[PDB]
Amino acid sequence: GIVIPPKALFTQQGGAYGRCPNGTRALTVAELRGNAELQTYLRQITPGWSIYGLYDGTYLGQAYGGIIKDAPPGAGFIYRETFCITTIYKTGQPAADHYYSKVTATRLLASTNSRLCAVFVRDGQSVIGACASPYEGRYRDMYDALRRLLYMIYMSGLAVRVHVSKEEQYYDYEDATFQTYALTGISLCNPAASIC
Amino acid sequence: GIVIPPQEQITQHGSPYGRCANKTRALTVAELRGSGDLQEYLRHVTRGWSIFALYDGTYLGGEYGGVIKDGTPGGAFDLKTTFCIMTTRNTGQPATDHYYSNVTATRLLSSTNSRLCAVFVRSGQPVIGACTSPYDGKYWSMYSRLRKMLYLIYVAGISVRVHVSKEEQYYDYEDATFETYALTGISICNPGSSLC
Amino acid sequence: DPPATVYRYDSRPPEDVFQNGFTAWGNNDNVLEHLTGRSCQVGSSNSAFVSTSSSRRYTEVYLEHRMQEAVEAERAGRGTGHFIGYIYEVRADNNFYGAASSYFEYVDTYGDNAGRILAGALATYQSEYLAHRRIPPENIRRVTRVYHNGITGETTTTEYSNARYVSQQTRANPNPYTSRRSVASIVGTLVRMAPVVGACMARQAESSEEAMVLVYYESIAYSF
Amino acid sequence: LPTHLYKNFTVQELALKLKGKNQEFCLTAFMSGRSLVRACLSDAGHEHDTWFDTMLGFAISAYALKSRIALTVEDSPYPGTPGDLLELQICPLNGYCE
Amino acid sequence: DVPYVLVKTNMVVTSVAMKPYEVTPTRMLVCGIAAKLGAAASSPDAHVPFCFGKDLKRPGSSPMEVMLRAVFMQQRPLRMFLGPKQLTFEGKPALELIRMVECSGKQDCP
Amino acid sequence: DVPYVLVKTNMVVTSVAMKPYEVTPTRMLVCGIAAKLGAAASSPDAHVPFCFGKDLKRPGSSPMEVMLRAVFMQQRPLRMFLGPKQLTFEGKPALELIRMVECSGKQDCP
């Protein structure tokens, strides 16, 4: 099952013609579908007979009855108002260390002035996603070091123990079955040294 | 046929636990053992039934005489004091370019807050040693670019034409059979080319 | 468990492959020269190994890209845009040894500095299996021919079965292949770019029907 | 600014040196049928030009990958001298720049 | 410019380029040519010029710049959000690249 | 901390890593695992954890970083000066690396 962007990430003055401002990303219908409160919120803020673009489908103002109609990626961008969510969310959980072993890095992703991310996968399953931005975040200064090793391990098929702080959550990948947090450390596996 | 560090390449007070300070490094046996100025200096300033640590041995000074005893690498770091040589010598020569050709970069050396060096060999035998540091030197500005060319040719085994400036001399390498100056250029070169 | 089926992308067509399988370039059976690409290098080809991969997906992707190269070449004017590639399905037996396992053993015998980190990262990445000396027609079971008209964009998949294929209940050898220490100057891992592919694999897949630009994985595996 | 473009050339020489007291790097692009196209990117004094480092790295990658590049050099008012490199493009790996 | 954000799929970065940002000298342009894997040698999505701005005041490499490097060396299939803006690359115009996620499969990348 | 500086020879870095500096934000660690050749897997020298600092206020790569990378990739045996300090890496203490020099032969690396 997918992960649902919390209502609070809903960019009030959403993007325009599919160009969500930097740091924000087009809400998907799969997402809007599963978020009851956001739908609920939408029915109140939406003026009559207005249509809204989404990455997937479209949203028809309460006049049309509040309809989430599907459509191809980027099709609803024809319309001026696009629903966008802010990619970063402050969980509130403590900044403790959490890590996963035997994972590989895949699925790069980069917005403009935002994070570079990767999906860590163990034997097929997407285990967790990690992001790093030099532009913002608790660990904005460690970006330059991390991206370099992020890169090496992605180019090589090297297993890794990844560290992540659930301090802040990231909603960059749309319709993800996995959670994405802040990258804080990478450690190539070393079984014979108690690493993986 | 070794390079002997000048008398001034020496710390006023030696260091504890074998921890020669940053920018300095332990004196060898073969190095002290080949320096009239150094031994003398020691005899005229070593009191008591005291012994000192060298990288690869010990120096019984004071009433012991001034005996240099062969040892084991880092084996005498056990002692209260180890003898440290500063590794940077401002030669005071002119900035004339000097180059060595067909050299291949081998044996890297690096240390906390100091320089990155390589021993440029040719035909098996060393030829020169060059170093780069972003922290100190007349050529700190060149580090960023140089470290790039240095890494490339190191891992790829590329022959090159190295360019050094003698304005600075270094003793980072222990028991050097070659001099070691400031790196100032690298050229993936075409025999007798203008770019060399 | 040793895989029973391994794959092999190749440019050679069924009529000969089904009749005479594949034969290693030579007798150099040194596990590191092979994994490091040295025994597949242009002018040093002699590996007593036939590169194969227990991963069909891996081969599919290689082909997928070799094809796109055709479309690109045509756009540049160096080609027709047409491509025909094949993926052979092979019954693995004892004479099939795992690249990785072999590499590690080699390193766990001659010591760490004897190996090359990425050379093993690759062997894992490719799921390479090594057919020692010879992979005979009786073992090749089926094949997938792929044709792509680059200009129109048509792709035509077609399978063919080799009659000579003898059925057996076998699988790859479960034990690592072993060789003596290499006595060669190995600068590093020879890989072909976009996507990164072992030089043996990449190179063994060519025939008569330009030089392959081989590069050291080490020189680009890190940003500059 | 008699600029020029050279497609499907290869990097043959790469060099980081010092011009007087300014940093400087140059490459020699070569194509079998012809002469060598030498262009140099010099450290413009103005410390901020990340350009130098960026182009330098990019040129090192081009050298590393062994790819054909497509390069744009301006010109120097004295023949037998490398012109200034203003743009560099790495052609599709394993192929040609169209 | 383009009236609205396009979104190409199954694209692969084929060539990359660094150029001085025609306007502001504090920035440069990293441009490339994306191609829809398998398309007709002649379809519009078989040759898509793109560019993105790089700030020369900020040291290092931007997230885009790092991915752009990986996916080129590896030829990974991507979803690209192109436009509206149009920069000029190689004479012709080129769409600004504003985002780009690697394709997982037929699911997100048709 | 350990009593004094250790000098291990024929060390081969077998794993690298990065992590933030427990006590400080403006810095982080880069760590590894070195292994002395010949040593049995039981031997503690079969896997020595090390680390060293990196100042996050100075962008770039330190010489020890550059070296580490090259020697790691190349599986170059080393002579490392570890201690006397200890930092935490992967839950355990690891010796601060203050210097390392590649080996030439049995002479300098016995």
Swiss-Prot record, chain B:
Stretches that traverse the bilayer: none
Subcellular location: Secreted; Host cell membrane
Organism, as annotated: Bordetella pertussis (strain Tohama I / ATCC BAA-589 / NCTC 13251)
Descriptive protein name: Pertussis toxin subunit 2
Annotated family: Belongs to the pertussis toxin S2/S3 subunits family.
GO annotation, biological process: symbiont-mediated activation of host MAPK cascade
Biological role: PTX oligomer B binds to receptors on the eukaryotic cell surface and facilitates the translocation of the toxic subunit across the cell membrane.
Disulphide-bridged cysteine pairs: C20-C84, C117-C131, C189-C196
Molecular function in Gene Ontology: toxin activity
UniProt xrefs under InterPro entries: APT_dom, APT_N_sf, CTDL_fold, Enterotoxin, ToxinB_BORPE, ToxinB_su2/3_C_BORPE
Oligomeric form and interacting partners: Pertussis toxin contains five different chains, S1-S5. They are organized into 2 functional subunits: A, composed of S1 (which is toxic) and B, containing S2, S3, S5, and two copies of S4 (B binds to the membrane receptors). Dimers of S2-S4 and S3-S4 are held together by S5.
Alphabetical keyword list: Disulfide bond, Host cell membrane, Host membrane, Membrane, Secreted, Signal, Toxin, Virulence, Whooping cough
SUPFAM superfamilies: Bacterial enterotoxins (SSF50203), C-type lectin-like (SSF56436)
From Swiss-Prot, chain C:
EC number, UniProt record: 2.4.2.-
Gene3D superfamilies: Heat-Labile Enterotoxin, subunit A (3.90.210.10)
Gene Ontology terms: biological process: symbiont-mediated activation of host G protein-coupled receptor signal transduction
Effect annotated for changing C40S: 33% of wild-type NAD-glycohydrolase activity
Disulfide-bonded cysteines: C40-C200
Summary of the function given for this chain in its UniProt record: S1 is an NAD-dependent ADP-ribosyltransferase, which plays a crucial role in the pathogenesis of B.pertussis causing disruption of normal host cellular regulation. It catalyzes the ADP-ribosylation of a cysteine in the alpha subunit of host heterotrimeric G proteins. In the absence of G proteins it also catalyzes the cleavage of NAD(+) into ADP-ribose and nicotinamide. It irreversibly uncouples the G-alpha GTP-binding proteins from their membrane receptors.
Family: Belongs to the bacterial exotoxin subunit A family.
Protein name: Pertussis toxin subunit 1
Origin species: Bordetella pertussis (strain Tohama I / ATCC BAA-589 / NCTC 13251)
Protein's gene: ptxA
Swiss-Prot record, chain D:
Record localization: Secreted; Host cell membrane
Residue ranges crossing the lipid bilayer per the database entry: none
One annotated Gene Ontology cellular component of this protein: membrane
Keyword Secreted assigned: yes
Keyword annotations: Disulfide bond, Host cell membrane, Host membrane, Membrane, Secreted, Signal, Toxin, Virulence, Whooping cough
The UniProt record lists the keyword Disulfide bond: yes
Domain of life: Bacteria
GO molecular function, one term: toxin activity
Positions in coiled-coil regions: none
Disulfide bonds: C26-C40, C91-C97
Quaternary state and interactors: Pertussis toxin contains five different chains, S1-S5. They are organized into 2 functional subunits: A, composed of S1 (which is toxic) and B, containing S2, S3, S5, and two copies of S4 (B binds to the membrane receptors). Dimers of S2-S4 and S3-S4 are held together by S5.
Reported function: PTX oligomer B binds to receptors on the eukaryotic cell surface and facilitates the translocation of the toxic subunit across the cell membrane.
Full protein name: Pertussis toxin subunit 5
Organism, scientific name: Bordetella pertussis (strain Tohama I / ATCC BAA-589 / NCTC 13251)
Gene: ptxE
Section covered of the full-length record: 36 to 133 of 133
Curated annotation (Swiss-Prot), chains E, F:
Broad class of where this protein is predominantly found: secreted
Subcellular location: Secreted; Host cell membrane
Gene Ontology molecular function, alphabetical: toxin activity
Keywords in alphabetical order: Disulfide bond, Host cell membrane, Host membrane, Membrane, Secreted, Signal, Toxin, Virulence, Whooping cough
Gene Ontology cellular component terms for the protein in this record: extracellular region; host cell plasma membrane; membrane
Disulphide-bonded residues: C31-C51, C103-C109
Oxidoreductase found in the keyword field: no
Keyword Secreted: yes
Task of the protein: PTX oligomer B binds to receptors on the eukaryotic cell surface and facilitates the translocation of the toxic subunit across the cell membrane.
Subunit comment: Pertussis toxin contains five different chains, S1-S5. They are organized into 2 functional subunits: A, composed of S1 (which is toxic) and B, containing S2, S3, S5, and two copies of S4 (B binds to the membrane receptors). Dimers of S2-S4 and S3-S4 are held together by S5.
Protein name per Swiss-Prot or TrEMBL: Pertussis toxin subunit 4
Gene: ptxD
